[PDB]
């Protein structure tokens, strides 16, 4: 078993946001945004799952909430400019 | 008309030594990745519900300046 690393997806200083969930095992993983959007199916490589989820909407705040039941792990990564 | 969005690696990931570039996109669609203009095929993993993800080592990411997500429109970002 392995908890996932969650990475924020913010635009490259140059609105859609997202989160990247890398290296977790096993499935599944639940993804919500500030608990109330596109969560793509996972891909399996090297025995680890990776997934991503976007959201269309800095003044107001957005935070993706990713949960991994298997390892009783949670992660809530705010997206910063 | 898909609304494409491209994203650079986060500092958090880079700190761990990896570099993933994410791109959010009739079903038929084709995504092409470019690094400094030339096509890159290895290290790409796709998902459809579309999302394309180019993973590289930090060293490799640091070797180039431009990353481009090209659909079937072109969206990109320069590290510098």
Short mmCIF file of C-alpha atoms in Angstrom, two decimals, chain A:
data_model
loop_
_atom_site.label_atom_id
_atom_site.label_comp_id
_atom_site.label_asym_id
_atom_site.label_seq_id
_atom_site.Cartn_x
_atom_site.Cartn_y
_atom_site.Cartn_z
CA UNK A 1 0.00 0.00 0.00
CA UNK A 2 1.14 3.57 -0.68
CA UNK A 3 -0.47 6.95 0.02
CA UNK A 4 -0.50 9.36 -2.93
CA UNK A 5 1.41 12.59 -3.34
CA UNK A 6 -0.95 15.39 -4.34
CA UNK A 7 0.38 18.18 -6.56
CA UNK A 8 -1.41 21.48 -7.24
CA UNK A 9 -2.13 22.48 -10.83
CA UNK A 10 -2.13 26.24 -11.25
CA UNK A 11 -1.62 28.28 -14.44
CA UNK A 12 1.94 29.26 -15.38
CA UNK A 13 1.88 32.99 -14.81
CA UNK A 14 1.18 33.92 -18.43
CA UNK A 15 -10.04 29.86 -15.23
CA UNK A 16 -9.21 26.16 -15.00
CA UNK A 17 -7.44 24.56 -11.95
CA UNK A 18 -6.51 20.99 -11.03
CA UNK A 19 -4.68 18.46 -8.83
CA UNK A 20 -2.26 15.65 -9.65
CA UNK A 21 -2.37 12.45 -7.59
CA UNK A 22 0.83 10.44 -8.12
CA UNK A 23 2.01 7.02 -6.99
CA UNK A 24 -0.79 5.59 -4.85
CA UNK A 25 -1.90 1.98 -4.43
CA UNK A 26 -4.39 0.58 -4.63
CA UNK A 27 -7.54 2.11 -6.10
CA UNK A 28 -9.71 4.02 -5.70
CA UNK A 29 -9.30 7.66 -4.65
CA UNK A 30 -12.00 10.26 -4.07
CA UNK A 31 -11.52 13.80 -5.25
CA UNK A 32 -13.68 16.79 -4.37
CA UNK A 33 -13.15 20.51 -4.52
CA UNK A 34 -13.52 22.50 -1.35
CA UNK A 35 -16.11 19.73 -0.68
CA UNK A 36 -18.79 21.28 -2.88
CA UNK A 37 -14.86 19.52 -12.26
CA UNK A 38 -13.43 16.51 -14.13
CA UNK A 39 -11.86 13.49 -12.36
CA UNK A 40 -10.06 11.35 -14.95
CA UNK A 41 -9.63 7.57 -14.62
CA UNK A 42 -6.31 6.42 -13.20
CA UNK A 43 -3.39 4.91 -15.12
CA UNK A 44 -1.17 2.20 -13.64
CA UNK A 45 2.58 2.30 -14.12
CA UNK A 46 5.27 0.57 -12.06
CA UNK A 47 2.54 -0.64 -9.69
CA UNK A 48 1.46 2.89 -8.77
CA UNK A 49 -1.64 4.78 -9.83
CA UNK A 50 -1.71 8.35 -11.08
CA UNK A 51 -4.78 10.48 -11.66
CA UNK A 52 -5.75 14.10 -12.24
CA UNK A 53 -8.80 16.30 -11.78
CA UNK A 54 -9.57 19.78 -13.06
CA UNK A 55 -12.06 22.46 -12.09
CA UNK A 56 -13.31 25.54 -13.91
CA UNK A 57 -14.39 28.67 -12.05
CA UNK A 58 -7.06 33.93 -6.34
CA UNK A 59 -9.54 36.27 -4.60
CA UNK A 60 -11.91 33.40 -3.90
CA UNK A 61 -10.18 30.20 -2.76
CA UNK A 62 -10.11 26.71 -4.26
CA UNK A 63 -8.79 23.55 -2.61
CA UNK A 64 -8.94 20.01 -3.94
CA UNK A 65 -9.70 17.37 -1.32
CA UNK A 66 -8.22 14.00 -2.16
CA UNK A 67 -8.92 10.93 -0.05
CA UNK A 68 -7.28 7.50 -0.30
CA UNK A 69 -9.37 4.99 1.71
CA UNK A 70 -6.85 2.14 1.49
CA UNK A 71 -4.20 3.99 3.54
CA UNK A 72 -6.67 6.06 5.58
CA UNK A 73 -4.97 9.08 4.07
CA UNK A 74 -6.42 12.49 3.24
CA UNK A 75 -4.85 15.48 1.52
CA UNK A 76 -6.29 18.91 0.83
CA UNK A 77 -4.05 20.98 -1.39
CA UNK A 78 -4.98 24.62 -1.81
CA UNK A 79 -4.06 25.98 -5.24
CA UNK A 80 -1.87 29.07 -5.09
CA UNK A 81 -1.11 31.54 -7.88
#
